[PDB]
A paper describes a structure:
While full-length PlexinD1cyto failed to crystallize, we crystallized and determined the structures of a construct with the JM segment truncated (still referred to as PlexinD1cyto for simplicity), both in the apo-form (to 2.7 Å resolution) and in complex with GIPC1 (to 3.2 Å resolution). The overall structure of apo-PlexinD1cyto are similar to other plexincyto structures reported previously. The RBD forms an independent ubiquitin-like domain that packs against one side of the GAP domain. The two GAP-homology regions (C1 and C2) fold together to form the GAP domain. The GAP domain of plexins contains a regulatory element referred to as the activation segment, which toggles between the closed inactive and open active conformations under the control of plexin dimerization. The activation segment in the PlexinD1cyto structure appears partially open, although it was crystallized in the monomeric state. In the apo-PlexinD1cyto structure, the C-terminal tail region (residues 1916–1925) constitutes the C-terminal part of the last helix in the GAP domain, except for the last two residues (Glu1924 and Ala1925) which are disordered.
GIPC1 (GAIP interacting protein, C-terminus 1) and its two paralogs GIPC2 and GIPC3 are universal adaptor proteins that bind and regulate vesicular trafficking of many transmembrane proteins. GIPCs contribute to the endocytosis process by tethering the cargo proteins on endocytic vesicles to the motor protein myosin VI. GIPCs contain a central PDZ (PSD-95, Dlg and ZO-1) domain that mediates the interaction with the C-terminal PDZ-binding motif (PBM) in cargo proteins. The transmembrane receptor PlexinD1 contains a C-terminal ‘SEA’ motif that constitutes a PBM and interacts with GIPC1.
Residue numbers in the entry: 1345 to 1361, 1389 to 1563, 1568 to 1655, 1670 to 1677, 1697 to 1809, 1820 to 1923
The structure:
């Protein structure tokens, strides 16, 4: 089965560039009844929009509140408020209005292109939360198949162990620009039932150990696989002699001052040879304008193989499933369009840019470049290089105006994207009550998975760090002032600082 990550690990890897937020904090249990008091009070402040909005705006005014802090703050907020998604959303929307109003003297086409603010990161976390269903239901499967096809196609030819260059690839920079003879090899491998694994002559023994591990650990998530450097490989040449096969040993040869890694052909391993796997820089080499034709068609073959898989994926991402309409996407796109009308922005391009800078570029591009955010699978610099080419094509598909390989396909992708944004305009509008019932359901669903207490405590450190600034901000806000929020804020600080000393001291 497709090795999906649990929802918590998905959130963990996308929200933060964490184990603390998953398990209950092993803080002292004698001051714990006192701690829950301080966190409860602070929750009350956080759950009041007149505090939170002022709180965020105040932190962002600081010249020493770094970009990562604004992002760490945003994610902590998403986790803490995860049980109150409706309230979280409305906070985000107000904060988004403030962002748009602040950019009223700038080009509207530059909106939401980066993530240098608390709200921008909040948007990414909202999209992520709301698209996890899409992944599990429709997009996750073709994406995983594409990954499998990418890996399969590259393994057809040789791969350099050091440079990572191969015969097949989508990236012009990773082409094995050398012409080296390489014949396939089948190996009857054991693992203390015997199985058969295909490799190449030029494959190093690390690479072979890896290719073997993939066969024996097929129906197993990657985090449970042993490693190449953890296993040994043993050849059975005859009945009186066996040979442990390693990348480097006594048989290793030096050429031109450099030492070649031991290949499958270095030991001259025959076809169908019995092998046994068991548990236990720039000084060494392996295989070392206009692009020539002999390399060009190696790029074409790889693209041609995956083309079916790739089309399926983009279609999955850029189309509506009738069984389950994208309520969230529809809700935010209605918000963007409504926000544009109020300000005299009718230019179709800017709207297209807004939508694009909200969902496809915010969530999907990083998803295409980071499959580990979704699956418990392996990351290699080579597969990454192919994903970069693919993701760039997706990026180009979203625009309006090494980039030669997919040049023919992009115009059709653009029409799909335009056909996709039209679909969302064409689906029946969802009311606020309908969308909130959805957000309520999702909050109920994932209620006991995140440790909100740890999240609150981390947020508090920002509040403590800027204790006098928030106080001033709260008193400079007549609404916050009238409802005694600066008093309630100081009550939290006082109570928290008494509790933290009781625990750690």
């Amino acid at each position: 089965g497709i090795p999906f990550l649990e929802y918590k690990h998905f959130v963990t890897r996308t929200f933060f560039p964490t184990h603390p937020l998953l398990g209950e904090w092993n803080i002292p249990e004698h001051c714990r009844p006192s701690m829950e008091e301080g966190i409860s009070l602070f929750s009350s402040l956080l759950n009041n929009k007149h505090f939170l909005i002022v709180f965020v705006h105040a932190l962002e005014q600081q010249k020493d509140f770094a970009v990562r802090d604004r992002c760490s703050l945003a994610s902590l907020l998403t986790i803490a408020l995860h049980g109150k998604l409706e309230y979280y959303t409305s906070i985000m929307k107000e904060l988004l209005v403030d962002l748009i109003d602040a950019s009223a003297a700038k080009n509207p086409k530059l909106m939401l292109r980066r993530t240098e603010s608390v709200v921008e990161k909040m948007l990414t976390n909202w999209m992520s939360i709301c698209m996890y269903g899409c992944l599990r239901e429709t997009v996750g499967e073709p994406f995983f198949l594409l990954l499998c096809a990418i890996k399969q196609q590259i393994n057809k030819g040789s791969i350099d162990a050091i440079t990572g260059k191969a015969r097949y690839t989508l990236n012009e920079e990773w082409l094995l620009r050398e012409n080296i003879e390489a014949k396939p090899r089948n190996l009857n491998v054991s693992f203390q039932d015997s199985l058969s694994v295909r490799a190449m002559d030029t494959d190093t023994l690390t690479q072979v150990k890896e290719k073997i591990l993939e066969a024996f650990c097929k129906n197993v998530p990657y985090s449970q696989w042993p490693r190449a450097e953890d296993v040994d490989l043993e050849w059975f040449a005859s009945s009186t002699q066996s040979y442990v096969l390693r990348d480097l040993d006594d048989t290793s040869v030096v050429e031109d001052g450099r030492k070649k890694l031991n290949t499958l052909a270095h030991y001259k391993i025959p076809e169908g040879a019995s092998l046994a796997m068991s548990l236990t820089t720039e000084k060494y080499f392996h295989l070392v304008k206009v692009l020539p034709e002999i390399y060009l068609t190696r790029l074409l073959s790889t693209k041609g193989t995956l083309q079916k898989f790739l089309d399926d994926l983009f279609k999955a991402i850029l189309s509506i499933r009738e069984d389950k309409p994208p309520l969230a996407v529809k809700y935010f796109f209605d918000f963007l369009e409504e926000q544009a009308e109020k300000r005299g922005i009718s230019d179709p391009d800017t709207l297209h840019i807004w939508k694009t800078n909200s969902l496809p570029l915010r969530f999907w591009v990083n998803i295409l470049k980071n499959p580990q955010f979704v699956f418990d699978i392996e990351k290699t610099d080579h597969i990454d290089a192919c994903l970069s080419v693919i993701a760039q094509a997706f990026i180009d598909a979203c625009s309006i105006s090494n980039k030669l390989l997919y040049a023919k396909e992009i115009p059709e992708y653009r029409k799909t994207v335009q056909r996709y944004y039209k679909q969302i305009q064409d689906m029946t509008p969802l009311s606020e009550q309908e969308m909130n019932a959805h957000l309520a359901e999702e909050s109920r669903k994932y209620q006991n998975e995140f440790n909100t207490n740890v999240a609150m405590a981390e947020i508090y450190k920002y509040a403590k760090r800027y204790r006098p600034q928030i106080m001033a901000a709260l008193e400079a806000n007549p609404t916050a002032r009238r409802t005694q929020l600066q008093h309630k804020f100081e009550q939290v600080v006082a109570l928290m600082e008494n509790n933290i000393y009781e625990c750690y001291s």
